Amino acid sequence: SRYEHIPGPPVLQDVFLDWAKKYGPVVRVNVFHKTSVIVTSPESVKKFLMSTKYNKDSKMYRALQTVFGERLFGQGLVSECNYERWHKQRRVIDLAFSRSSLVSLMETFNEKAEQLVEILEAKADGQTPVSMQDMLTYTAMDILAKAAFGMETSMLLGAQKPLSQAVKLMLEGITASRKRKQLREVRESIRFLRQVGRDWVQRRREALKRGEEVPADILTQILKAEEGAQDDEGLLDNFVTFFIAGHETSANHLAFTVMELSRQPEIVARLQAEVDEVIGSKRYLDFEDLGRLQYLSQVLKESLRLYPPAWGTFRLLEEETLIDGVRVPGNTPLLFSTYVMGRMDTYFEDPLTFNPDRFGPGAPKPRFTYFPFSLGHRSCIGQQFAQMEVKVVMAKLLQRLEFRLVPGQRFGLQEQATLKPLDPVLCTLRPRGW
Ligand code: HEM
Numbered sequence: 001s002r003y004e005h006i007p008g009p010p011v012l013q014d015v016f017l018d019w020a021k022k023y024g025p026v027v028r029v030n031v032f033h034k035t036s037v038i039v040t041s042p043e044s045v046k047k048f049l050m051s052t053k054y055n056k057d058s059k060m061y062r063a064l065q066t067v068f069g070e071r072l073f074g075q076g077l078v079s080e081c082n083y084e085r086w087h088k089q090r091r092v093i094d095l096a097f098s099r100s101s102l103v104s105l106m107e108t109f110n111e112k113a114e115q116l117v118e119i120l121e122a123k124a125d126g127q128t129p130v131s132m133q134d135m136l137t138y139t140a141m142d143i144l145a146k147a148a149f150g151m152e153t154s155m156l157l158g159a160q161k162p163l164s165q166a167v168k169l170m171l172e173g174i175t176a177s178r179k180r181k182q183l184r185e186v187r188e189s190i191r192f193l194r195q196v197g198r199d200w201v202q203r204r205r206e207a208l209k210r211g212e213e214v215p216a217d218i219l220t221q222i223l224k225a226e227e228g229a230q231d232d233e234g235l236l237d238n239f240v241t242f243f244i245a246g247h248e249t250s251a252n253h254l255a256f257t258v259m260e261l262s263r264q265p266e267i268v269a270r271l272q273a274e275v276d277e278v279i280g281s282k283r284y285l286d287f288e289d290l291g292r293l294q295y296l297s298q299v300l301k302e303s304l305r306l307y308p309p310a311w312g313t314f315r316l317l318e319e320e321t322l323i324d325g326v327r328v329p330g331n332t333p334l335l336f337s338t339y340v341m342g343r344m345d346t347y348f349e350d351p352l353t354f355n356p357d358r359f360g361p362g363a364p365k366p367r368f369t370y371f372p373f374s375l376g377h378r379s380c381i382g383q384q385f386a387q388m389e390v391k392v393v394m395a396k397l398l399q400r401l402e403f404r405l406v407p408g409q410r411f412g413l414q415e416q417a418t419l420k421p422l423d424p425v426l427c428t429l430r431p432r433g434w
């Protein structure tokens with residue numbers, strides 16, 4: 001009753017879209033364990049996301065914190081809702097994301113991209129069906145394992161199959177929580193990953209004790225953040241956090257892009273020409289090269305408009321407030337969705353048209369209607385890491401390979417925590433040059 005006055009009805013994100021179009025910029029939803037309000041006006045996006053006065057709603061994030069009694073993200077960097085505790089760990093971990101820290105990862109990005117491309121080249125008979133979803137997540141996993149934790153997962157070599165099963169099952173579990181054997185598998189998956197965390201953490205401390213060389217990475221900084229804890233629960237919270245966040249959304253984004261570009265030959269031909277002109281025959285992309293891939297840069301932005309893996313963020317409204325002419329009571333979770341806003345014609349002309357020119361220099365920039373890495377103090381720490389990562393992978397693909405989506409492969413979405421292609425993005429492949 002306390003929310004009955006708010007406009008509302010008497011893939012779920014598409015229902016959110018229908019509701020936003022039908023009911024306006026402030027709509028109540030009852031799908032989560034708590035009534036919440038989805039807010040889709042730019043003014044509100046700006047007001048709520050671009051302020052330190054508004055914090056994440058812990059009731060909504062507890063779904064990431066613990067899954068079916070089993071601690072997952074805990075109080076790591078994504079799911080920590082206390083400002084003081086968040087701010088402390090953010091600033092320590094920030095160091096691993098400095099310009100120079102990121103620049104030094106170019107070798108890892110290039111190596112794993114080059115491995116992927118050679119693996120695909122060997123299958124490029126225009127006949128063999130290849131799951132680009134699988135191949136791209138293997139690549140994202142291998143990049144992250146090495147870049148963040150100094151570990152070689154070798155998923156591109158077909159290793160660590162149990163590990164990717166664990167990730168899959170726990171992600172499905174986050175959404176499902178919104179029988180007997182599903183719960184068992186999910187719980188086991190979560191514990192498996194935290195145990196992997198302990199393993200790799202042990203390996204690092206031992207490396208350190210034996211006075212071996214340890215490059216400064218994300219793991220260095222999540223250890224620094226926990227210098228005087230009474231246990232390793234915070235450490236493992238952050239391990240899991242970065243282990244998942246550090247590859248899942250990147251994988252989703254890559255898969256979405258390849259899927260869409262597979263029906264955009266004109267754009268692909270343009271992307272192919274850009275890559276040819278800037279890197280040439282080179283096998284390695286420098287940092288400075290990434291900047292000159294302007295058209296690919298725009299393509300990836302447009303891919304994030306239509307297909308954002310991270311679809312929602314929540315803030316706690318503490319005091320009753322008027323939001324776009326709607327009275328919203330105090331203690332209410334507010335939902336912000338780049339997915340919904342990206343598909344609204346009031347925000348984007350022909351919203352379902354894939355046009356990279358929307359992000360061309362001299363194009364009017366989306367003013368608070370596009371936020372695939374969110375906005376304000378709780379924006380993605382991994383944003384530049386991701387942008388560089390996916391540019392390197394995409395550029396090597398485009399340099400070397402032609403992709404054709406196997407007929408019957410759908411363009412639909414599925415929700416497994418984040419949004420990703422429903423289908424495995426099966427493609428046949430041919431080398432460039434006939
Ligand atoms: C295309 C790839 C990526 C997308 C679209 C993306 C999107 C987002 C979004 C929307 C948030 C806000 C979360 C929230 O409001 O609850 C976020 C935060 C975060 N992302 Fe990402 N992300 C990406 C890649 C990465 C990478 C590569 C890393 C790690 C290397 C990462 C780690 C994080 C972390 C730790 C946070 C929490 C930051 C904080 O609150 O201080 N993400 N990301």
Ligand SMILES: CC(C)N(c1cccc(-c2cnco2)c1)S(=O)(=O)c1cccc(Cl)c1
Binds near residue numbers: 060246312313382
């Ligand atoms: C914006 C967040 C909370 N989402 C999300 C989830 C997992 C990893 C990442 C991530 C961020 N950076 C890298 O990975 C982002 S989500 O939108 O998928 C989501 C999922 C479940 C419930 C909700 Cl409410 C939202």
